[PDB]
Amino acid sequence: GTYGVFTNAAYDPTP
Amino acid sequence: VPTEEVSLEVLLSNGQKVLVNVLTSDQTEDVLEAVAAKLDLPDDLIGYFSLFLVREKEDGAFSFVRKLQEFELPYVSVTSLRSQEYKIVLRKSYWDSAYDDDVMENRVGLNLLYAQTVSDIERGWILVTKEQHRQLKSLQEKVSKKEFLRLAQTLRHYGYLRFDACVADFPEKDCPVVVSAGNSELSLQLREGSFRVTRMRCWRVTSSVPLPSGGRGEVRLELAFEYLMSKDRLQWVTITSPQAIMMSICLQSMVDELMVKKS
Helix, strand or coil: CCCEEEECCCCCCCC | CCCCEEEEEEEECCCCEEEEEEECCCCHHHHHHHHHHHHCCCHHHHHHEEEEEEEECCCCCEEEEEECCCCCCHHHHHHCCCCCCEEEEEEECCCCHHHHHHHCCCHHHHHHHHHHHHHHHHCCCCECCHHHHHHHHHHHHHCCHHHHHHHHCCCECCCCEECCCEEECCCCCCEEEEEEEECCEEEEECCEEEEEHHHEEEEEEEECCCECCCCCCECCEEEEEEEEEECCEEEEEEEECCCHHHHHHHHHHHHHHHHHHHC
16 A cells, blocks of 8 residues: 555564 | 557666666566666576666756556556656665675676765765765775775665655654665654664555646645654654655565564
8 A cells, every 4th residue: 555554563662 | 558569768876777678568577677687687686676766856866756566567657657857767675784795796786786875975865074075986986896885884874765855843843854764764864863663663654635736736745653752652753745655665665674684
């Protein structure tokens, strides 16, 4: 897709 | 599109022309392979490079519109715009400079990296001072392409993609900014902010409806990313840019590369 929300697979909230 | 053989110009980052004969119905990978054949780039290095649609500005600089996807027909992609300002460009398409080692093992790969790095410096994508730039253009004559590239790898924003000047709501609403993507982050030069891809929970691309020309409609586009500013604190940062989709593509590409590495 082009518009809307993209989930970030690389998100890492570990500080 | 009816299948027909045509001539397609593909530019390198510095504007050098590579002319290939392809089919109107050839997809991105087919065109990429034809370009690689014309340049004598080995098959095993093709995956390190991609084709991009760009707008060439009066001064010859490129504003990147999108990376061409697998399903696209590059001839159609560029021709359908009906404007000679739009071009197809070949450029390295990975982010971690460690991969430069693989590319530089081949003469043609090394030549391609050298060409785009020289142009990156010339166009201000790589950030040097007036004096440094002076030195570089000198070193350029005096050192090998390999030695030049090894030095370039240490320069500020080597490996980044720069976007046209736009605005963002960080740090304040409607702040003029230059955004660049690279090294698993978005850089916002307002002062500077550095937003790590691994701290973005998601991002969103939004567009207004098409609006009457101020014979082309106009659209207000935004890229917003949801950033972990500190522990348990998420904050949306919004960039207003006609290149929001290209920014989104870069974020996805950077996240993808991190995941591939992780695996």
